[PDB]
Amino acid sequence: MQRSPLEKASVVSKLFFSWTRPILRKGYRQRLELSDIYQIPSVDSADNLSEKLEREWDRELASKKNPKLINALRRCFFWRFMFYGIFLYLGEVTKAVQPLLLGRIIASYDPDNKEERSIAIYLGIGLCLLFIVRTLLLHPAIFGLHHIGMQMRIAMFSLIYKKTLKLSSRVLDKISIGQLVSLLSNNLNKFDEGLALAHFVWIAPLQVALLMGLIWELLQASAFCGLGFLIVLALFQAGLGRMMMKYRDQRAGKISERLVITSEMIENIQSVKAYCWEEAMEKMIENLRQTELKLTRKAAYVRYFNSSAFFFSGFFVVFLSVLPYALIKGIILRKIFTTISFCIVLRMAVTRQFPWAVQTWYDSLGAINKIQDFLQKQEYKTLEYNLTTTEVVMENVTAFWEGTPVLKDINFKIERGQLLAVAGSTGAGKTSLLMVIMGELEPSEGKIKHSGRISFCSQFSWIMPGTIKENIIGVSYDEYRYRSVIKACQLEEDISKFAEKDNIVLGEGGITLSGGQRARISLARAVYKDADLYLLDSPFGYLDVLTEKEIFESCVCKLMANKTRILVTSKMEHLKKADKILILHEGSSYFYGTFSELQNLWNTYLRYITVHKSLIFVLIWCLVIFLAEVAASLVVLWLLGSYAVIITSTSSYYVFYIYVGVADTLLAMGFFRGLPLVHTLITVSKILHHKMLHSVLQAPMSTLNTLKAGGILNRFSKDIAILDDLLPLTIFDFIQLLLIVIGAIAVVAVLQPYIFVATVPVIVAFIMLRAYFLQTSQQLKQLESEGRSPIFTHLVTSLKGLWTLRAFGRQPYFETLFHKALNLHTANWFLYLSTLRWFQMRIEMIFVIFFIAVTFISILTTGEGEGRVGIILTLAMNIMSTLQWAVNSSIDVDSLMRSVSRVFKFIDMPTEGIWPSGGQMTVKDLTAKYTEGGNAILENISFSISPGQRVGLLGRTGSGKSTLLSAFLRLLNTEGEIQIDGVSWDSITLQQWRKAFGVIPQKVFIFSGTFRKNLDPYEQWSDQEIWKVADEVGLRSVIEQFPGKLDFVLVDGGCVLSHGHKQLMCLARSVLSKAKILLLDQPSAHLDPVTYQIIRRTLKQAFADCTVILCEHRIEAMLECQQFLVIEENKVRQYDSIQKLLNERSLFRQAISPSDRVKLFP
Ligand SMILES: Cc1nn(C)cc1S(=O)(=O)NC(=O)c1ccc(-n2ccc(OCC(C)(C)C(F)(F)F)n2)nc1N1C[C@@H](C)CC1(C)C
Ligand SMILES: Cc1ccc(NC(=O)C2(c3ccc4c(c3)OC(F)(F)O4)CC2)nc1-c1cccc(C(=O)O)c1
Ligand SMILES: Nc1ncnc2c1ncn2[C@@H]1O[C@H](COP(=O)(O)OP(=O)(O)OP(=O)(O)O)[C@@H](O)[C@H]1O
Ligand SMILES: Nc1ncnc2c1ncn2[C@@H]1O[C@H](COP(=O)(O)OP(=O)(O)OP(=O)(O)O)[C@@H](O)[C@H]1O
Ligand SMILES: CC(C)CCC[C@@H](C)[C@H]1CC[C@H]2[C@@H]3CC=C4C[C@@H](O)CC[C@]4(C)[C@H]3CC[C@]12C
Ligand SMILES: CCCCCCCCCCCC
Ligand SMILES: [Mg+2]
Ligand SMILES: [Mg+2]
């Protein structure tokens, strides 16, 4: 990774962009490597840009009553922005005066024009210098504006992320992940290219004033008749832009709603497969796409008329201004052609450059104001303190999540070094109590007083990407402390069974880990940090009795006996070793005191075209009409082979020049062709999205584990939007230009078969340079597109762990990691944008030398009479002016076609592919492994389950209990044989095999949607049945506390619910499914013994029949099981009674609670 060559480039090298030569030569022959990409220039580093704009934005907040973000942007970039505007203007003025020189050179071919001939050579010298100046003025200026826009985007994106880490929890409900991704993705490439267009909001009016005075010289008052037509088009295009904005704004809300639902289902893909919810989720997303695709089409129709105004105005603007003059006095062909030359530039300013500039300001200012509102949102108030009385005291705190208070009149005092136990039922407010202490939930009444040093362990374990060792420690590294906590947390046994010991690369959310392993890593992280108060929100949920006992008596009670700590626990054996006990019920303190006190009381193009047959028929329809237009032109043109229009034998060559200047209107695609073309291009994107989503839900789990969350969102957000908005119009413009060039050459070749010969050297030169450039351009665009994924990945993980980020104070670390993602994307994007400027500058320089060669040859060969070489050659160069536009348009199409190839790559992902009456199942030689060629988790497992009995699956955390349950459903690589009721799993199809099971996953899955939709996504059960199940599982009181009884929309994964309420939701689904074989993966993870009775009574009433495989850790749930399966050292051991199982194991029964002990051994 070498230093940027721009740093030491010479002045001439900067001007011509010659410093890009090394990578253009390397990428042509062989593929680019990681070492070929240079570092970013220091000026556009994210760190420097963020500090610059932040320093100026703070001045507005302290100097003006109405702080504006645009004023801070002006103070940073205005003078460079306006500096490039004057050179862009001068290049366009050089363009406006070209017909003054070129028109006289063309007139010198007529022997009658003796005045033009006398100075023809001097006009050639001036014309050549005109071309050179224009080339050197435009391209450096346009690239300078591109660089300013890139720096503006980077600076604004850093401020957005820094604000995100400060947002208050009360506004987090209203800010979804889809909203933030939409804001970033929409401006990722659009914003940077916009600054090249912004200056035309004032350049174009000045061009119109200049050109109208030159047209006035020819046609005195008749000129204004053509201007009035352009004013009508200007008002028409202004109305089109306002309609397009209206449709786009209405569509924005549905796009954000789609992205959040798409992210949720792919994160929980394993639960989706186990439930067999692929069909329901596809139909759910399909209805969201349908509503937003209607607004896409209406916007696309309006944008057709906006982009067709240029081509259709070519004839009428000239005709309206030539006709009144010709009727009063005769007009010569020379004067007609000169009017056309000026009007070509005039039409470009009015109908192409100005409205695009106006729309750019609407887009940029719309995004700036949207970001400005985000930067002023409510901020998290950190009430940190330097010191205290070394104790924490709470005084009659009442809190609301907003009419029922979550907490009321809570008070307690905890002296230094004491342990407080928090008890209660499900939904009693035990988690909310800890949120208020942290300052994450502001109370409406009461006060809290303690020191600022707090350590926090969440009930929902969050794992940041990186190393296991990197998760436990912060940026500091104390080896003696690291070994201490790892031993006390019982992590040594699990670490020794890993390929990298403790240097394993964990994914986002720790997919590769077990449920209880994530709990231990979350607990070890909290105890490693030095603090005054320790908040532990039930870390013993997913742990067995033996591991729980060891950790409690060796880490909580031993390593931190002299530090204040609060423990949420439902075990009576933990209460006996706590200094004080608090019992919550409905948010009220049911009891406060001591224990004793309580005791007493290339191929992408072809595949894109042929995916929909309707597109092929529309293209043929366009082709047939085009042939008739060319044929009609031939007839009328060949037919031409005091009068209103004066023609002479020596002036007849102007006829072909006039045709070329108006060919863009005769060959324009009318609404009979433009509208159906754009309409059918949108149906292609509709089909591709359905195929892409379908294949993702069908891929094997091994493939999906390698995909990162931000790489999934990158394709479904950015690429899909490109196929909807940009590609249909970019293809239309390319097709229009190609037909114009093809038709113009075809018409003049048959009548004059030397123009076709003269244009071959120019055509081949353009094609050869295009082929050379595209070898490197396609690789850089691929690297830049893949550089957007790390930005989205970092955004997702920061929102999921926001509370843990603030608690441990690691905000500066995450801000630095976000700058790495920005700098990584900038390196590829800047390099891609630089080589593109080289190509577009060279394509114009190639045009210049051919025009210079033509100019001098034409003038010198023109003898005393006539001169035919100049007539032919100057016509050929007029045609090649349009091909230059077509070639540049072809590069834009190929840039967008990279998004098509990335979509097809996901579609090509491989697919993973009265019977249930008894429930008997036999297993033979089952071997389970997560990856092919990986280590096995289970080996040669064999057992049999008789029909109708219940089985207890036991074992230590991380032994492979969840692996065994996943092996039944073929969620991993299996090598055994399983026969349910006599049929082998190989014979019957996978889709039928999984439908025989009713599953309760260990990881609960709740998506953004109605209560009714979560319980029943296929809508196959009535409301009465749903309420009937809600009675059995105890969910009526939970539902009725919400405004909508089965109509309330759950958001953010159901954050409104408590942890134990999500368990009852998963129990409700299993009872409603009514499957013969049931696989329950610890259905009572955090329930207190009171709520566990709901599981116990459902186990014998709803599941009175059927074969039930329990996977519980609590000993009380083993009284109902006939058989027992014990996993240890990758092997299953079968028992027939619980007493014989515990007879052989001493340490296991030493950890059993005395209450359960007497129930097992009377
Ligand atoms: C080497 C190298 N390899 N690569 C990848 C980049 C580089 S380069 O940037 O160093 N040079 C070139 O790349 C380069 C520089 C100038 C030119 N010019 C074409 C006309 C022209 O006249 C200029 C003109 C008289 C109009 C005036 F001057 F008056 F304006 N000049 N062509 C260049 N090319 C080299 C090949 C890659 C293809 C080709 C022919 C287009
Ligand atoms: C009076 C004025 C002068 C210069 C600017 N712009 C700039 O200096 C820069 C810029 C910013 C956004 C852009 C843009 C260029 O080009 C775009 F891509 F189109 O978007 C170089 C930063 N802006 C204004 C202005 C407009 C509108 C409102 C206000 C206001 O104070 O309310 C101020
Ligand atoms: N996707 C995966 N890829 C690789 N290894 C995995 C994966 N999922 C789990 N493992 C590993 O396989 C082993 C067993 O997994 P685990 O779910 O299966 O056991 P468990 O008995 O269910 O644990 P717990 O009681 O904590 O839920 C562990 O070492 C775990 O780290
Ligand atoms: N973000 C929230 N917005 C609104 N209500 C909430 C929110 N979080 C929790 N609640 C509600 O507040 C009550 C208590 O929440 P909960 O976390 O706090 O208690 P808990 O004792 O920790 O329960 P559990 O044992 O299930 O973890 C419940 O009625 C729950 O539905
Ligand atoms: C960029 C702008 C502000 C430059 C100046 C614009 C105006 C003042 C210029 C642009 C073109 C100019 C005209 C060009 C040609 C002629 C014909 C000549 O026989 C009389 C002057 C006259 C009619 C000029 C008058 C001034 C004019 C209309
Ligand atoms: C150089 C381009 C400046 C563009 C200024 C846009 C108009 C701003 C008007 C003031 C806000 C209402
Ligand atoms: Mg809780
Ligand atoms: Mg498990």
Coordinates of C-alpha atoms in Angstrom, one line a residue, residues 397-795:
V397 CA -38.4 6.6 42.8
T398 CA -41.4 6.5 40.4
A399 CA -40.7 5.8 36.7
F400 CA -42.7 5.5 33.4
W401 CA -41.8 4.1 30.0
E402 CA -44.2 6.7 28.5
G403 CA -50.8 5.1 32.6
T404 CA -49.7 2.4 34.9
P405 CA -46.3 3.3 36.6
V406 CA -43.5 0.9 35.9
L407 CA -42.0 1.6 39.4
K408 CA -43.4 3.4 42.4
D409 CA -42.0 4.4 45.8
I410 CA -38.9 2.2 45.5
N411 CA -36.3 2.9 48.1
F412 CA -33.2 1.1 49.5
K413 CA -29.7 1.8 50.8
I414 CA -26.6 -0.3 50.1
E415 CA -23.4 0.4 52.1
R416 CA -19.9 -0.3 50.8
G417 CA -19.1 -3.9 50.0
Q418 CA -22.7 -5.3 50.5
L419 CA -24.7 -7.5 48.1
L420 CA -28.3 -6.8 47.3
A421 CA -30.6 -9.5 45.9
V422 CA -33.5 -8.5 43.6
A423 CA -36.4 -10.9 43.4
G424 CA -39.9 -11.0 41.8
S425 CA -42.1 -12.4 39.1
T426 CA -42.0 -12.0 35.3
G427 CA -42.5 -8.4 34.3
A428 CA -42.2 -7.1 37.9
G429 CA -39.8 -4.4 36.8
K430 CA -36.5 -6.0 37.9
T431 CA -34.7 -5.0 34.6
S432 CA -36.3 -1.6 34.6
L433 CA -34.9 -1.0 38.1
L434 CA -31.4 -1.4 36.9
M435 CA -32.0 0.9 33.9
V436 CA -33.1 3.7 36.3
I437 CA -29.9 3.3 38.3
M438 CA -27.7 3.6 35.2
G439 CA -29.4 6.8 34.2
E440 CA -30.9 5.1 31.1
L441 CA -34.5 5.8 32.4
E442 CA -35.2 9.1 33.9
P443 CA -37.7 8.9 36.9
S444 CA -40.6 11.3 37.2
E445 CA -40.2 11.4 41.0
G446 CA -37.6 10.6 43.5
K447 CA -33.8 10.9 43.5
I448 CA -30.8 8.6 43.1
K449 CA -27.3 9.2 44.7
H450 CA -24.2 7.2 44.1
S451 CA -20.7 7.3 42.4
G452 CA -20.3 7.3 38.7
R453 CA -18.3 4.1 38.3
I454 CA -20.8 1.4 37.2
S455 CA -20.4 -2.0 35.6
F456 CA -23.3 -3.6 33.8
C457 CA -24.2 -7.1 32.6
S458 CA -27.3 -7.2 30.3
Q459 CA -29.9 -10.0 30.3
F460 CA -29.5 -10.1 26.5
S461 CA -25.8 -10.8 25.9
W462 CA -24.3 -8.7 23.1
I463 CA -21.0 -9.8 21.5
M464 CA -18.9 -7.3 19.5
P465 CA -17.0 -8.6 16.5
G466 CA -13.4 -9.5 17.2
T467 CA -11.4 -11.8 19.5
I468 CA -12.7 -13.6 22.6
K469 CA -9.8 -12.0 24.6
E470 CA -10.6 -8.7 23.0
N471 CA -14.2 -8.9 24.2
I472 CA -13.2 -9.5 27.9
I473 CA -10.7 -6.7 28.2
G474 CA -10.9 -3.2 27.0
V475 CA -7.9 -1.5 25.4
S476 CA -5.9 -2.3 28.6
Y477 CA -4.3 -5.7 29.2
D478 CA -3.5 -7.0 32.8
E479 CA -2.4 -10.6 32.5
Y480 CA -2.9 -11.5 36.2
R481 CA -6.5 -10.2 36.1
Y482 CA -7.2 -11.9 32.8
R483 CA -6.2 -15.3 34.1
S484 CA -8.1 -14.7 37.3
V485 CA -11.5 -13.9 35.8
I486 CA -11.2 -16.6 33.1
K487 CA -10.8 -19.3 35.8
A488 CA -13.6 -18.0 38.0
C489 CA -16.0 -17.8 35.1
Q490 CA -15.5 -21.5 34.2
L491 CA -14.4 -20.5 30.6
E492 CA -11.1 -22.5 30.7
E493 CA -12.9 -25.8 29.7
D494 CA -14.6 -24.2 26.7
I495 CA -11.5 -22.3 25.5
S496 CA -9.4 -25.5 25.3
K497 CA -11.8 -27.0 22.8
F498 CA -11.3 -24.3 20.2
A499 CA -9.0 -24.3 17.1
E500 CA -7.4 -20.9 18.1
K501 CA -7.7 -21.5 21.9
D502 CA -8.9 -17.9 22.7
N503 CA -8.0 -16.0 19.6
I504 CA -11.1 -17.1 17.6
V505 CA -12.7 -14.5 15.3
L506 CA -16.2 -14.0 16.7
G507 CA -18.9 -12.8 14.3
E508 CA -21.4 -10.0 14.9
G509 CA -23.6 -11.3 17.7
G510 CA -21.5 -14.4 18.4
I511 CA -23.2 -16.9 16.1
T512 CA -20.4 -19.4 16.5
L513 CA -20.9 -19.6 20.3
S514 CA -23.3 -21.4 22.5
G515 CA -26.1 -19.8 24.5
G516 CA -24.3 -20.2 27.8
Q517 CA -20.9 -19.4 26.4
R518 CA -22.2 -15.9 25.4
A519 CA -23.5 -15.4 28.9
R520 CA -20.1 -16.3 30.5
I521 CA -18.3 -13.9 28.1
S522 CA -20.7 -11.2 28.9
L523 CA -20.3 -11.8 32.7
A524 CA -16.5 -12.0 32.5
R525 CA -16.4 -8.6 30.7
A526 CA -18.4 -6.9 33.5
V527 CA -16.2 -8.3 36.3
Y528 CA -12.9 -7.5 34.5
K529 CA -13.7 -3.8 34.6
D530 CA -12.8 -1.9 37.8
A531 CA -15.8 0.0 39.1
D532 CA -17.7 0.8 42.3
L533 CA -21.1 -0.7 41.6
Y534 CA -21.8 -3.9 39.7
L535 CA -25.2 -4.6 38.1
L536 CA -25.8 -8.2 37.1
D537 CA -29.2 -8.7 35.4
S538 CA -29.6 -12.5 35.9
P539 CA -26.5 -14.0 34.3
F540 CA -27.3 -17.5 35.4
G541 CA -30.2 -18.1 33.1
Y542 CA -28.6 -20.4 30.5
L543 CA -26.3 -22.2 33.0
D544 CA -26.6 -25.6 34.6
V545 CA -26.8 -26.0 38.4
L546 CA -23.2 -27.1 38.7
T547 CA -21.6 -24.3 36.7
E548 CA -24.0 -21.8 38.4
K549 CA -22.9 -22.9 41.9
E550 CA -19.2 -22.7 41.1
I551 CA -19.4 -19.2 39.5
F552 CA -21.5 -17.8 42.3
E553 CA -19.3 -19.0 45.1
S554 CA -15.9 -18.3 43.4
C555 CA -16.6 -15.1 41.4
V556 CA -19.5 -13.2 42.8
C557 CA -18.9 -14.0 46.4
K558 CA -15.1 -14.3 46.4
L559 CA -13.4 -12.1 43.7
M560 CA -15.6 -9.1 44.5
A561 CA -16.5 -9.5 48.2
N562 CA -15.4 -5.9 48.9
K563 CA -17.3 -4.3 46.0
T564 CA -20.9 -3.2 46.0
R565 CA -23.0 -5.4 43.7
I566 CA -26.7 -5.9 42.8
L567 CA -27.8 -9.4 41.6
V568 CA -31.2 -10.2 40.0
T569 CA -31.8 -13.8 40.9
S570 CA -34.7 -16.2 41.4
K571 CA -32.8 -18.8 43.5
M572 CA -33.6 -19.0 47.2
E573 CA -30.1 -20.3 47.8
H574 CA -28.6 -17.0 46.5
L575 CA -30.9 -15.0 48.9
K576 CA -29.3 -16.5 52.0
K577 CA -25.9 -15.0 51.2
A578 CA -27.2 -11.4 50.4
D579 CA -26.9 -8.6 52.9
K580 CA -30.4 -7.2 51.8
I581 CA -33.3 -8.6 49.8
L582 CA -35.7 -6.7 47.6
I583 CA -38.9 -8.3 46.3
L584 CA -40.8 -6.6 43.5
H585 CA -44.4 -7.2 42.4
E586 CA -46.2 -5.1 39.8
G587 CA -43.5 -2.4 40.2
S588 CA -44.1 -2.1 44.0
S589 CA -41.6 -3.2 46.7
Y590 CA -43.4 -6.2 48.2
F591 CA -40.6 -6.6 50.8
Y592 CA -37.3 -5.0 51.8
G593 CA -35.0 -6.3 54.5
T594 CA -32.8 -9.3 55.5
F595 CA -33.3 -13.0 55.0
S596 CA -34.1 -13.7 58.6
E597 CA -36.7 -10.9 58.6
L598 CA -38.4 -12.5 55.6
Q599 CA -38.3 -15.8 57.3
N600 CA -40.5 -14.6 60.1
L601 CA -43.1 -12.8 57.9
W602 CA -20.7 -9.6 -21.6
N603 CA -23.1 -12.2 -20.4
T604 CA -24.7 -10.0 -17.8
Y605 CA -26.3 -7.9 -20.6
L606 CA -27.7 -11.0 -22.3
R607 CA -29.1 -12.4 -19.1
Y608 CA -30.6 -9.1 -18.0
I609 CA -32.5 -8.8 -21.4
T610 CA -33.9 -12.3 -21.6
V611 CA -35.2 -12.6 -18.1
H612 CA -38.5 -11.1 -19.2
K613 CA -40.0 -11.7 -22.6
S614 CA -42.0 -8.5 -22.6
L615 CA -38.8 -6.5 -22.8
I616 CA -37.7 -8.3 -26.0
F617 CA -41.0 -7.5 -27.7
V618 CA -40.7 -3.8 -26.8
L619 CA -37.2 -3.6 -28.1
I620 CA -38.3 -5.2 -31.4
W621 CA -41.1 -2.7 -31.5
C622 CA -38.6 0.2 -31.1
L623 CA -36.3 -1.3 -33.8
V624 CA -39.1 -1.6 -36.5
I625 CA -40.2 2.0 -36.1
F626 CA -36.6 3.2 -36.3
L627 CA -36.2 1.5 -39.7
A628 CA -39.3 3.3 -41.0
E629 CA -37.9 6.6 -39.9
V630 CA -34.6 6.0 -41.7
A631 CA -36.4 4.8 -44.8
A632 CA -38.7 7.9 -44.8
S633 CA -35.7 10.2 -44.4
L634 CA -34.0 8.6 -47.4
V635 CA -37.0 9.2 -49.7
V636 CA -37.6 12.8 -48.8
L637 CA -33.8 13.6 -48.8
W638 CA -33.3 11.9 -52.2
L639 CA -36.4 13.7 -53.5
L640 CA -34.6 17.1 -53.1
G641 CA -31.9 15.9 -55.4
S642 CA -38.4 34.9 -56.0
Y643 CA -38.4 31.8 -53.8
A644 CA -38.9 31.6 -50.0
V645 CA -35.8 29.5 -49.6
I646 CA -32.8 30.3 -51.9
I647 CA -30.7 27.4 -53.0
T648 CA -27.9 27.3 -55.6
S649 CA -25.9 24.6 -57.2
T650 CA -22.8 25.6 -55.3
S651 CA -24.7 26.0 -52.0
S652 CA -26.6 22.7 -52.1
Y653 CA -24.2 21.0 -49.8
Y654 CA -25.9 22.7 -46.9
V655 CA -28.8 20.3 -47.3
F656 CA -26.9 17.4 -45.6
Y657 CA -25.6 19.7 -42.8
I658 CA -29.2 20.8 -42.0
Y659 CA -30.4 17.2 -41.8
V660 CA -27.7 16.3 -39.3
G661 CA -28.6 19.2 -37.1
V662 CA -32.2 18.1 -36.9
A663 CA -31.7 14.3 -36.9
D664 CA -32.2 14.2 -33.2
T665 CA -35.8 15.2 -33.5
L666 CA -36.7 13.1 -36.5
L667 CA -35.4 10.0 -34.7
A668 CA -36.6 10.9 -31.2
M669 CA -38.4 8.1 -29.3
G670 CA -42.0 9.2 -28.8
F671 CA -44.2 8.2 -25.9
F672 CA -45.3 5.2 -27.9
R673 CA -41.8 3.8 -27.4
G674 CA -40.3 5.7 -24.4
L675 CA -43.0 4.9 -21.8
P676 CA -43.3 1.1 -22.5
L677 CA -39.5 0.8 -22.5
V678 CA -39.2 2.4 -19.1
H679 CA -42.3 0.5 -17.8
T680 CA -40.9 -2.9 -18.8
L681 CA -37.4 -2.2 -17.3
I682 CA -39.1 -1.8 -13.9
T683 CA -40.7 -5.2 -14.1
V684 CA -37.3 -6.7 -14.6
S685 CA -36.2 -5.3 -11.2
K686 CA -39.4 -6.6 -9.7
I687 CA -38.7 -10.2 -10.9
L688 CA -35.0 -10.1 -9.9
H689 CA -35.8 -9.0 -6.3
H690 CA -38.2 -11.9 -5.9
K691 CA -35.7 -14.4 -7.2
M692 CA -32.9 -12.9 -5.0
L693 CA -34.9 -13.0 -1.8
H694 CA -36.2 -16.5 -2.6
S695 CA -32.7 -18.0 -3.1
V696 CA -31.4 -16.4 0.2
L697 CA -34.1 -18.1 2.3
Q698 CA -33.3 -21.5 0.6
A699 CA -29.5 -21.4 1.0
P700 CA -27.8 -23.9 3.3
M701 CA -27.0 -22.6 6.8
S702 CA -23.2 -23.1 6.3
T703 CA -23.2 -20.6 3.4
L704 CA -25.3 -18.0 5.3
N705 CA -23.0 -18.1 8.3
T706 CA -20.2 -16.5 6.2
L707 CA -22.3 -13.5 5.1
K708 CA -22.1 -10.4 7.2
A709 CA -25.2 -8.3 8.1
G710 CA -23.8 -5.2 6.4
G711 CA -23.1 -7.1 3.2
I712 CA -26.7 -8.3 3.1
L713 CA -28.1 -4.8 3.6
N714 CA -25.6 -3.5 1.0
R715 CA -27.2 -5.6 -1.8
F716 CA -30.8 -5.3 -0.7
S717 CA -30.7 -1.6 -0.2
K718 CA -28.2 0.0 -2.6
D719 CA -28.3 -2.4 -5.6
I720 CA -32.1 -2.7 -5.6
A721 CA -32.5 1.0 -5.5
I722 CA -30.1 1.4 -8.5
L723 CA -32.2 -1.1 -10.6
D724 CA -35.3 0.9 -9.8
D725 CA -34.2 4.5 -10.2
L726 CA -31.0 4.9 -12.2
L727 CA -30.9 2.0 -14.6
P728 CA -34.2 2.5 -16.5
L729 CA -33.4 6.1 -17.4
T730 CA -29.7 5.6 -18.1
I731 CA -30.5 2.8 -20.5
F732 CA -33.1 5.0 -22.2
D733 CA -30.7 7.8 -22.8
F734 CA -28.0 5.4 -24.1
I735 CA -30.5 3.8 -26.5
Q736 CA -31.7 7.2 -27.8
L737 CA -28.2 8.4 -28.5
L738 CA -27.2 5.2 -30.2
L739 CA -30.2 5.3 -32.6
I740 CA -29.4 8.9 -33.5
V741 CA -25.7 8.1 -34.5
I742 CA -26.7 4.9 -36.3
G743 CA -29.4 6.6 -38.3
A744 CA -27.3 9.7 -39.2
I745 CA -24.5 7.6 -40.6
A746 CA -26.8 5.3 -42.5
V747 CA -28.7 8.1 -44.2
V748 CA -25.6 10.0 -45.4
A749 CA -23.7 6.9 -46.3
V750 CA -26.1 5.7 -49.0
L751 CA -26.4 9.2 -50.6
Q752 CA -22.7 10.0 -50.1
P753 CA -20.5 6.9 -49.6
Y754 CA -17.4 8.8 -48.5
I755 CA -18.6 10.1 -45.1
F756 CA -18.9 6.5 -43.9
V757 CA -15.3 5.9 -45.0
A758 CA -14.0 9.2 -43.5
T759 CA -15.5 8.3 -40.0
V760 CA -14.0 4.9 -39.6
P761 CA -10.7 6.1 -38.0
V762 CA -12.6 8.1 -35.4
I763 CA -15.0 5.2 -34.6
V764 CA -12.3 2.6 -34.2
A765 CA -10.3 5.0 -32.0
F766 CA -13.2 5.5 -29.6
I767 CA -13.9 1.7 -29.4
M768 CA -10.3 0.8 -28.8
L769 CA -9.9 3.3 -25.9
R770 CA -13.1 2.1 -24.4
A771 CA -12.0 -1.5 -24.4
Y772 CA -8.6 -0.6 -22.8
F773 CA -10.3 1.5 -20.1
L774 CA -13.0 -1.0 -19.1
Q775 CA -10.4 -3.6 -18.1
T776 CA -9.5 -1.5 -15.1
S777 CA -12.7 0.4 -14.6
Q778 CA -14.7 -2.7 -13.8
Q779 CA -12.3 -3.9 -11.2
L780 CA -12.2 -0.6 -9.4
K781 CA -16.0 -0.4 -9.4
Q782 CA -16.3 -3.9 -7.9
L783 CA -13.9 -3.0 -5.1
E784 CA -15.7 0.3 -4.4
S785 CA -19.1 -1.5 -4.2
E786 CA -17.7 -4.1 -1.8
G787 CA -16.2 -1.2 0.3
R788 CA -19.7 -0.1 1.3
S789 CA -20.3 -3.2 3.4
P790 CA -18.0 -2.4 6.4
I791 CA -19.8 0.9 6.8
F792 CA -23.2 -0.8 7.2
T793 CA -21.8 -3.6 9.3
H794 CA -20.5 -1.1 11.9
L795 CA -23.7 0.8 12.0

